[PDB]
Amino acid sequence: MKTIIINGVQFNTDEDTTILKFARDNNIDISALCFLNNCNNDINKCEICTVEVEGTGLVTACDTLIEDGMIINTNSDAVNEKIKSRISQLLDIHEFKCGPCNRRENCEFLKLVIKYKARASKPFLPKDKTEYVDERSKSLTVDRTKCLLCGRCVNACGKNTETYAMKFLNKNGKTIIGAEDEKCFDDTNCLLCGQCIIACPVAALSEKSHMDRVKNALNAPEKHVIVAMAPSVRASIGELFNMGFGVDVTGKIYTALRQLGFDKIFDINFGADMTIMEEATELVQRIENNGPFPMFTSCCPGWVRQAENYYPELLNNLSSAKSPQQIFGTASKTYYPSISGLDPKNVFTVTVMPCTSKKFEADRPQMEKDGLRDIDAVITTRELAKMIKDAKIPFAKLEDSEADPAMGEYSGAGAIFGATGGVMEAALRSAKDFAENAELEDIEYKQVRGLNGIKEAEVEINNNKYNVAVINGASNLFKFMKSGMINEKQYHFIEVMACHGGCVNGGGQPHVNPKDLEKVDIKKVRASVLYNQDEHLSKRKSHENTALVKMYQNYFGKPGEGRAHEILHFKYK
Numbered sequence: 001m002k003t004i005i006i007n008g009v010q011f012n013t014d015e016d017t018t019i020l021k022f023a024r025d026n027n028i029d030i031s032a033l034c035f036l037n038n039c040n041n042d043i044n045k046c047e048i049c050t051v052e053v054e055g056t057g058l059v060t061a062c063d064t065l066i067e068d069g070m071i072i073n074t075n076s077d078a079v080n081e082k083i084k085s086r087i088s089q090l091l092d093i094h095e096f097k098c099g100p101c102n103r104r105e106n107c108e109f110l111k112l113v114i115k116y117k118a119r120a121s122k123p124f125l126p127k128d129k130t131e132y133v134d135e136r137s138k139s140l141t142v143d144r145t146k147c148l149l150c151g152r153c154v155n156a157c158g159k160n161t162e163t164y165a166m167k168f169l170n171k172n173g174k175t176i177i178g179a180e181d182e183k184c185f186d187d188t189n190c191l192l193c194g195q196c197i198i199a200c201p202v203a204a205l206s207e208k209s210h211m212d213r214v215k216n217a218l219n220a221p222e223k224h225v226i227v228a229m230a231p232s233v234r235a236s237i238g239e240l241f242n243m244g245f246g247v248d249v250t251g252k253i254y255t256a257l258r259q260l261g262f263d264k265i266f267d268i269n270f271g272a273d274m275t276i277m278e279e280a281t282e283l284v285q286r287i288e289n290n291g292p293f294p295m296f297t298s299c300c301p302g303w304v305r306q307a308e309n310y311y312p313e314l315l316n317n318l319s320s321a322k323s324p325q326q327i328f329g330t331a332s333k334t335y336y337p338s339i340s341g342l343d344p345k346n347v348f349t350v351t352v353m354p355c356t357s358k359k360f361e362a363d364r365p366q367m368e369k370d371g372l373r374d375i376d377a378v379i380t381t382r383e384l385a386k387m388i389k390d391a392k393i394p395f396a397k398l399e400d401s402e403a404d405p406a407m408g409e410y411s412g413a414g415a416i417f418g419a420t421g422g423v424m425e426a427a428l429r430s431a432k433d434f435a436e437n438a439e440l441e442d443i444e445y446k447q448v449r450g451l452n453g454i455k456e457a458e459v460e461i462n463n464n465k466y467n468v469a470v471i472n473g474a475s476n477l478f479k480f481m482k483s484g485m486i487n488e489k490q491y492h493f494i495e496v497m498a499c500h501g502g503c504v505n506g507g508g509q510p511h512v513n514p515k516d517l518e519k520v521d522i523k524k525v526r527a528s529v530l531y532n533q534d535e536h537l538s539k540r541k542s543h544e545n546t547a548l549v550k551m552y553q554n555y556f557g558k559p560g561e562g563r564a565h566e567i568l569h570f571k572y573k
């Protein structure tokens with residue numbers, strides 16, 4: 001038993017924990033900055049978590065263990081001046097202009113500046129930001145006028161992907177962060193997954209903006225601008241409107257998009273059901289053809305880049321079905337004109353994604369046909385939130401509306417795509433019906449759900465056993481391959497998501513304050529919205545989507561052949 005005194009209050013505990021963790025468990029106020037994902041910035045600790053231990057002096061609470069007999073003061077004059085001096089030194093390298101800043105509303109640094117009334121010794125006012133900004137990437141951007149050199153992005157890249165694509169660099173004899181050799185991120189092994197963005201406490205790292213494309217398209221009188229949102233968006237964007245976590249705001253989004261002036265309100269979950277139609281058909285074909293095995297999902301751009309950069313020998317095993325975004329986009333320029341009369345060249349297709357890598361995918365040169373892009377613009381959940389706020393739309397008080405059904409209806413199988421294992425479960429629901437020529441009532445595959453890094457299961461399809469795996473995070477793909485687990489069984493179907501937890505934890509998602517991250521399981525609570533929708537939807541199999549079956553019946557024909565094969569597929573070499 002340890003007896004500790006903190007600000008003159010005695011505590012008795014048996015835990016082996018840091019001062020910071022004990023304080024947070026006991027409603028004691030200690031600030032922190034560089035401590036994230038259980039690590040601080042080892043090569044320059046920010047020391048914002050400074051506390052006083054009588055008899056020892058100032059220590060960093062984030063990595064100092066509590067000991068019996070400790071007497072801790074967290075708010076003494078010496079502690080305060082220490083922290084305020086460190087924030088002051090950060091202001092000296094920080095362009096403090098929150099007005100036009102894209103983190104103005106939820107910035108960790110602004111909060112600390114206000115809390116400690118910190119003041120620069122010399123305001124940082126660069127006149128040429130071109131040497132500080134890197135906008136070369138199709139997915140990520142760097143603004144080093146905001147960078148605190150807290151190392152959170154470098155540590156989060158290593159933890160989440162194990163690529164170490166985000167590095168410390170020496171530019172002109174001083175320290176920056178960036179890609180290898182300061183190249184454009186796209187030209188390195190970087191996955192463009194944006195987990196570095198999610199870890200950034202300020203506006204230093206951001207998504208590559210597509211707001212110019214959307215604004216210009218909405219302003220062009222001849223353009224018919226369609227919009228369709230990813231599964232994860234309806235489970236997360238409410239966080240940026242003070243609505244809390246785990247709120248289903250699907251109907252509010254549809255209304256907001258209409259008020260923004262979009263001409264048609266569809267949904268990427270419709271494209272998810274399309275992807276299942278092609279991919280589940282493909283899986284049954286590989287079963288009939290005895291291979292090739294395994295088939296990998298191909299809907300995650302971060303995983304595709306991981307395969308391209310690290311495992312190119314696996315590219316031919318990726319499912320040929322386009323991702324829900326790109327398969328939706330292809331149909332928006334072909335099927336949708338056939339039921340509307342629109343000139344296909346005048347259709348402008350915008351998606352809202354919880355993902356930065358989707359911008360790279362939509363901009364791939366071959367993701368077009370007859371000169372028409374599958375997808376013309378991709379905006380993140382964060383981008384849509386700012387678009388709604390800039391238009392002064394009272395999102396939290398909007399009435400519910402519905403999507404336009406022709407490419408907007410979706411089944412419960414498409415609805416769960418945004419969670420790790422969702423693509424697997426959705427695919428199996430259709431694959432089993434396809435292969436057994438039956439309509440099975442049992443459709444729930446809970447063995448592939450949850451936040452385990454690697455999830456494996458044996459499934460029975462048409463009186464034979466098959467091995468499936470769900471890889472939850474790019475770092476677990478490396479583990480799955482390097483450990484030899486890939487060879488320990490004959491796998492037949494493998495889902496890979498680059499982001500831990502699936503797209504609900506994507507790099508385009510709302511930032512979450514580090515304290516909130518310790519109090520709520522963001523990955524689980526966001527995903528629970530999607531599984532809740534699947535539970536209450538009248539159609540829970542992709543091939544039972546009534547608007548989808550009308551589209552295949554009246555336009556595309558049979559999945560995996562004929563017209564669907566020419567147009568809805570994509571292979572990587």
Ligand code: 402
Nearest residue numbers: 230231232272324325355418503
């Ligand atoms: N394309 C596509 Fe996907 C779908 O449907 C999204 O939109 Fe995902 C989400 N949410 C994202 O980003 S991508 C990977 N597969 C799972 S979900």
Ligand code: SF4
Nearest residue numbers: 097098101107202203
């Ligand atoms: S990063 Fe934060 S402190 Fe800096 S300008 Fe933006 S909102 Fe203000």
Ligand code: SF4
Nearest residue numbers: 157190191193194196
């Ligand atoms: S986008 Fe992903 S892979 Fe690239 S540096 Fe950021 S965290 Fe690492």
Ligand code: SF4
Nearest residue numbers: 147148150151153200
């Ligand atoms: S880019 Fe963001 S997370 Fe990375 S060191 Fe700079 S402030 Fe920290």
Ligand code: SF4
Nearest residue numbers: 300302355499503506
């Ligand atoms: S898991 Fe989802 S959000 Fe993350 S990189 Fe893949 S598609 Fe994008």
Ligand code: FES
Nearest residue numbers: 033034045047062
């Ligand atoms: S040294 Fe503790 S939060 Fe940075």
